[PDB]
Amino acid sequence: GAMGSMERASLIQKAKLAEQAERYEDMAAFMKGAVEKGEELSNEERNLLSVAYKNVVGGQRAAWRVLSSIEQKSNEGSEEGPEVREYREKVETELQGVCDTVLGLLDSHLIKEAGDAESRVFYLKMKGDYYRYLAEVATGDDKKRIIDSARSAYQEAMDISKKEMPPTNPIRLGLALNFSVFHYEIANSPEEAISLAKTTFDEAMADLHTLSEDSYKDSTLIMQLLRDNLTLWT
């Protein structure tokens, strides 16, 4: 791979520079290179990996939704060629390739080497998320299997998080948030979504008293998004 000749530490440095320059494609390539060095990632490094790919895939998803909406409008008193479909497919294929890339990193070999709850939950959450993005655009024979792949990853993460982390742990909270979004938007289970968000919020609220000011700020930030989703869902 193109980053094989660069030092691990230089790849991390340049990932941070790329972030500052809002060059997220570069950021992701640097972090892929770092992962491929074969060593485990630190907390900070895991966050750089996630931020990079979130930005890349987020641009693609936003593009895909724009194009899908145009395509949906075309197919209805609508005037008729293949360009909209072809272009949506082009963006879809690119999105799928980025998701496959992230899943590949997770499977080779980040998850298997992750023994601490913090790292293992982080990576299983990521696995859920990138299968969820695959599910968002899926319509083939394997679409149910893609959905089940996201559900299984999120469920394993949930099970570890409940046993090993406090209810205010931000990764635990982010996981529950994202699994709730899975239930609402992907799995056609709004009531599961609402229940999970409510229980997560309430159990976190009850644990806030144990936190420092800095930890409290991170936990409440995620709780606010759980609440805002609940407000929208109910």
Binding site: K54, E185, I222, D228, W233
Partner: peptide
């Protein structure tokens, strides 16, 4: 609804 990524840092 928003997912985690939507939150600013």
């Amino acid at each position: 609804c928003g997912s985690l990524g939507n939150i600013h840092h």
